[PDB]
Structures are given as structure tokens and as C-alpha cells.
Amino acid sequence: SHMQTPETAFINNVTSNGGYHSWHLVSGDLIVKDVCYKKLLHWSGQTICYADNKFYVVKNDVALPFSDLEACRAYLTSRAA
Secondary structure (H helix, E strand, O other): OOOOOOOOHHHHHHHOOOOOOOOEEOOOOEEEOOEEEEEEEEEOOEEEEEOOOOEEEEOOOOOOEOOOHHHHHOOOOOOOO
């Protein structure tokens, strides 16, 4: 709310262009587990939802908590060919 996170930092630059390569720019805001997430991106099959300081890539019906920035960057440029 005050200082954007480093995870969505490299993504924000793209979120202002219309989303990543395959990921489309969105922001519907998804709340789950009492942890209001931010729908930074969304694509048929997955959904980019980051929290206060934790990026998550929802799947067909499963979660996937990243580990580091390098992980998030490789989740948008290595999700599909």
C-alpha cells in the first residue's frame, strides 16, 4: 500500500503494458484464506495473485508459493513456450 514489493516490481513494468507474454493484465483482487491477494495477472489455466510480500500462482485447483524473485520471473517467462 505504501512501498510496492520486489516481486511485483519487475512485473508492474509489464502490468502497465497489458500483462506478461501469455499472462494478461488484470486486477480483480482475489481474497482467500483471509489473505486479500492482488490479481496482478491472469491467464487461462493459472492466476498471478501476490500478497503483502508473497507471490502465488494458483493452478487448475492448487497453490504454488514462490521462493525468490528469480522464481517469480521464471514463472512468467518460463510458464509456456
